[PDB]
Design a protein around this ligand. Sequence first.
Ligand SMILES: Nc1ncnc2c1ncn2[C@@H]1O[C@H](CSCC[C@H](N)C(=O)O)[C@@H](O)[C@H]1O
Ligand SMILES: Oc1cc(-c2ccc(F)cc2)cc2cccnc12
Ligand SMILES: [Cl-]
Ligand SMILES: [Mg+2]
Length: 213
Amino acid sequence: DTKEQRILRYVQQNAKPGDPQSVLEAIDTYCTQKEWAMNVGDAKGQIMDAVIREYSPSLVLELGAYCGYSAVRMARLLQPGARLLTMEMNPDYAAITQQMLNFAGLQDKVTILNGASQDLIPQLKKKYDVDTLDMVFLDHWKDRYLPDTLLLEKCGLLRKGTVLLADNVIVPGTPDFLAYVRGSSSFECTHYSSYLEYMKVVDGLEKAIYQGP
Ligand SMILES: Nc1ncnc2c1ncn2[C@@H]1O[C@H](CSCC[C@H](N)C(=O)O)[C@@H](O)[C@H]1O
Ligand SMILES: Oc1cc(-c2ccc(F)cc2)cc2cccnc12
Ligand SMILES: [Cl-]
Ligand SMILES: [Mg+2]
């Protein structure tokens, strides 16, 4: 098996079906005690939770799903009827994520789109009936953060107040994105210093709120 299949099986055997908090705890335990994996983790996850609670977004887009940890973490905090769309290019990972969401009981709140963000973003309005997004979690390959932000804006998917929350702005880092949003009058930015998942290494999140053109 793969590490991702091992994570899934661990959840299935050490968490309670339909209990998202138990799922998060099982993943965190496995990734602390057995094998590291690139989930946002509990340190940064607590900051994400605080942000989600503040904004109560009705429609969230996540870029990069992996095994579903962040999707579970966000979706468990959504209000009834609110929704998450998550984009995942790797079909093996998409299948893990779906199974993870199913086990957590969150499958009605989340749609996992199997494809590359740069191909799926232009389809959101017509194919997926999206008007504008309330929040975007950027956590895919770091070189896509700026191009996809710019694409989201081109596609008319951002509105005044759309919250972008970007993982890993220190490690691995996303220097072009960070410079761009911090220098642009179209974003109001805040840095949340934290730690790399499961590691004593500094990392951080950036929140960038879109202000319009
Ligand atoms: N352009 C792209 N579109 C969609 N998925 C992408 C992508 N570039 C990378 N990915 C995916 O981005 C993921 C990054 S890891 C995502 C971790 C997850 N957000 C969590 O915290 O639990 C990987 O699964 C990778 O396959
Ligand atoms: O949270 C993440 C962490 C890392 C990462 C990988 C190796 C390291 F040594 C340190 C950090 C990569 C990611 C790629 C995509 C989404 N998130 C990532
Ligand atoms: Cl952590
Ligand atoms: Mg990350």
